[PDB]
Amino acid sequence: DNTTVFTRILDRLLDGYDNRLRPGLGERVTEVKTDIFVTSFGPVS
Amino acid sequence: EGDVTVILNNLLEGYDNKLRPDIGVKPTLIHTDMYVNSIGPVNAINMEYTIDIFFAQTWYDRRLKFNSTIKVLRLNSNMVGKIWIPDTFFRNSKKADAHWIT
Ligand SMILES: *[C@@H]1O[C@H](CO)[C@@H](O[C@@H]2O[C@H](CO)[C@@H](O[C@@H]3O[C@H](CO[C@H]4O[C@H](CO[C@H]5O[C@H](CO)[C@@H](O)[C@H](O)[C@@H]5O)[C@@H](O)[C@H](O[C@H]5O[C@H](CO)[C@@H](O)[C@H](O)[C@@H]5O)[C@@H]4O)[C@@H](O)[C@H](O[C@H]4O[C@H](CO)[C@@H](O)[C@H](O)[C@@H]4O[C@H]4O[C@H](CO)[C@@H](O)[C@H](O)[C@@H]4O)[C@@H]3O)[C@H](O)[C@H]2NC(C)=O)[C@H](O)[C@H]1NC(C)=O
Asked: Which domain of life is it from (chain B)?
């Protein structure tokens, strides 16, 4: 019963969710904040 | 739900991606385009050259017709596997692959 509290939340989040559409499709522009952590700069061919 | 969700769920119900548009009516006219990015090295010992392109195809499908205020449904690659795409292959390609990252 301990895991059902988060299982119900995760099932409610994807209930009716359409993954084909970006968020704010009809009202705004989806802004994506990105950064890069280079773990190792490999050899240059 | 919403506007684009019900439009896509109404387009894709009763849809067979196995059958091309106008299967028993007329040939499907496909307008192709291409945008070369960087023709790579021309290998002479192995007799091939590498090319990187943006291969684009355009056709008509009467089953993918919707009447709403939305003009264009700009979709990602997730909707490719649900609709019909012509089996365009390159007749002189020794090896080729699309790009799958990210
Ligand atoms: C014989 O056996 C081999 C091995 O089992 C069979 O080959 C395999 O075939 C299956 C089925 O087609 C493939 O599954 C699909 O793979 C693609 C991605 O393919 C890319 O990644 C492959 C994995 O890469 C591994 O290895 C490399 C090595 O460098 C690593 O770097 C990677 O990290 C991985 O560890 C890679 O192998 C592919 O390259 C090969 O294939 C290409 C084809 O174009 C050739 O050019 C290459 O030379 C090479 O041979 C390639 O880079 C996935 O995208 C597929 O998932 C989608 O499609 C599924 C089916 O529709 C669907 O269920 C999924 O949800 C998913 O759908 C999504 O994407 C679709 C794309 O349009 C959308 O339409 C859709 O809506 C949705 O968004 C799937 O997982 C195997 O990868 C492939 N593996 C190999 C090794 O070739 C072979 O078929 C068998 N032969 C026979 C005749 O039985």
From this structure: Eukaryota
Dihedral sign of CA atoms B8, B14, B18, B22 in order: negative
Burial of A31 (C-beta count, 10 Å sphere; 0-12/13-18/19+): exposed
Closest chain A residue to B70 measured between Cα atoms? A26
Q: Do B1 and A16 touch (CB under 8 A)?
A: yes
Residue ID of nearest Cα to ligand 1 atom 76 = B78
Resolution value (Å, 1 decimal): 2.9
Experimental method: cryo-EM
Whole-Å CA distances, B75 to A6, B15, B80, B98? 31, 18, 9, 18
